[PDB]
Design a protein around this ligand. Structure first.
Ligand SMILES: NC(=[NH2+])NCCC[C@H](N)C(=O)O
Ligand code: NA
Length: 238
């Protein structure tokens, strides 16, 4: 027994998953997935923009009903909220200036300024592994601020979801001087297993509804066709 309107929170500074076009309309793979699921659920949905670190608290306060915002399914997150089945895979990777020697290692990063999104898995990773050991880890309200501070030369590097960095910055005008610094950083504990719809633990029926719709759009090929708009690779992963 779902609500008539499902309110979905997202942070719109994470192309190609969630961002705003020139008119301020919400666009991206997340938006397409959410709208497609809502359609199949036969509910109305309202998109709600907010800073990433506000999403889980807004959810718990019932100011939104769901989060679709490249939110990784982690053990930690599941202490607070529930998730749909996996929407797509999301590894983390560092970016730095082209021809930077930088690596995602303590040895490389000590004394350098590294940007992370506040409230993200990447902030947790960097705070635990890098900030404690003397890396200047800087946390930001949103990812656009990070990209800006990076191109302004205030940051040496930045850690975020690999596909967001690549499609949303590196392959975009602002990022032509930049590249990945080292390989993706795999850490089961911190980065979880792909992303999913974030939900209140007790909203069992909403989760089942989302899961049902997600299954169905994967089954009839809609998932792959939508994904093809953004990616020429297997975004879903395993
Ligand atoms: N729309 C966004 N800004 N998403 C950031 C997601 C970062 C990371 N995957 C996390 O779950 O913490
Ligand atoms: Na599947």
């Amino acid at each position: 027994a779902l609500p008539q309107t499902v309110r979905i929170g997202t942070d719109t500074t994470y192309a190609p998953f969630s961002s705003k076009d020139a008119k301020g309309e919400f666009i991206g793979f997340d938006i397409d997935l959410g709208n497609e699921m809502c359609k199949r659920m036969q509910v109305k949905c309202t998109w709600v923009a907010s800073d990433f670190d506000a999403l889980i608290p807004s959810l718990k306060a019932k100011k939104i009903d769901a989060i679709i915002s490249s939110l990784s399914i982690t053990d930690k997150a599941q202490q607070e909220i529930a998730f749909s089945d996996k929407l797509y895979a999301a590894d983390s990777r560092l970016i730095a200036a082209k021809g930077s020697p930088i690596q995602p290692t303590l040895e490389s990063l000590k004394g350098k300024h590294v940007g992370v999104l506040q409230g993200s898995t990447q902030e947790a990773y960097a705070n635990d592994n890098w900030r404690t050991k003397g890396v200047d880890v800087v946390a930001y309200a949103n990812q656009d601020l990070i990209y800006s501070d990076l191109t302004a030369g205030r940051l040496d590097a930045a850690l975020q979801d690999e596909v967001a960095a690549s499609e949303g910055f590196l392959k975009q005008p602002a990022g032509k001087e930049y590249a990945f610094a080292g390989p993706s950083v795999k850490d089961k504990k911190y980065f979880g297993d792909g992303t999913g719809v974030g939900l209140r633990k007790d909203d069992t029926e909403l989760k089942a509804a989302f899961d049902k719709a997600l299954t169905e759009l994967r089954q009839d090929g809609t998932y792959d066709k939508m994904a093809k708009k953004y990616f020429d690779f297997n975004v879903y992963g395993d």
